[PDB]
Amino acid sequence: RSMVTQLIQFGSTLQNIIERQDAESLNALLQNQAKELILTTLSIQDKT
Amino acid sequence: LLIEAEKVSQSEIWRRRRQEWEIQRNNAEAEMKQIDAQLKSLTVRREAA
Numbered sequence: 001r002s003m004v005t006q007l008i009q010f011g012s013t014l015q016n017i018i019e020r021q022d023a024e025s026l027n028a029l030l031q032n033q034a035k036e037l038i039l040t041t042l043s044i045q046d047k048t
Numbered sequence: 049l050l051i052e053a054e055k056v057s058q059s060e061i062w063r064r065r066r067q068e069w070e071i072q073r074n075n076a077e078a079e080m081k082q083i084d085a086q087l088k089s090l091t092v093r094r095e096a097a
Contacts, residue, residue, distance in 0.1 A: 044096055047092060047093075047095055047096035048096065
């Protein structure tokens with residue numbers, strides 16, 4: 001029983017880690033897409 | 049002398065008529081160059097779109 005509750009502590013920690021790394025990868029993806037968009041708006045200002 | 053006066057007056061109104069023709073020609077050419085430069089502006093707006 002002591003072994004099982006130790007294991008369920010590991011399971012909770014692993015769940016938190018997985019959700020956290022997915023949030024971080026999503027954040028980096030948003031940043032790169034913002035970079036491409038600001039390039040396009042620069043070209044449009046030049047044509048203005 | 050009155051005949052000669054009428055002749056020279058008719059020649060002078062012909063000259064003034066020709067000068068008005070020339071002013072109209074220059075306005076037409078100026079508007080034409082204006083519309084060509086406005087075409088350049090519009091194709092720049094097309095590239096932006």
